[PDB]
């Protein structure tokens, strides 16, 4: 029962920690990509200017 128990829960930890690293660390995407619009707005502004 211990074996099965630890096995299941460790595998749970593993999986959740996989997505955990993925979600927490990759979440910087929006901040990093702010420029996508934050400068294209100026792109359009310069046209009429």
């Amino acid at each position: 029962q211990f074996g099965s128990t630890l096995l299941s829960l460790l595998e749970r930890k593993d999986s959740l920690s996989f997505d955990a690293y993925q979600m927490i660390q990759s979440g910087d995407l929006y901040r990093f990509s702010i420029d996508l619009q934050q400068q294209d707005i100026d792109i359009n502004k310069a046209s009429l200017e």
Binding site: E11, D14, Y21, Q25, S26
Partner: protein, 49 residues
Amino acid sequence: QQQQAMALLDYFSERFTNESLYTWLISQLSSLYLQAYDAVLSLCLSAEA
């Protein structure tokens, strides 16, 4: 993305619960399971006799 991806693969590999442990088990387990078969054989033979 590429850099954090290879770091992710490393992190995933450093599971501290690897399948290699699992292979170690199953191999061992399988041998034990053989020995178990051997026991049962003796049991049933003697029984039927």
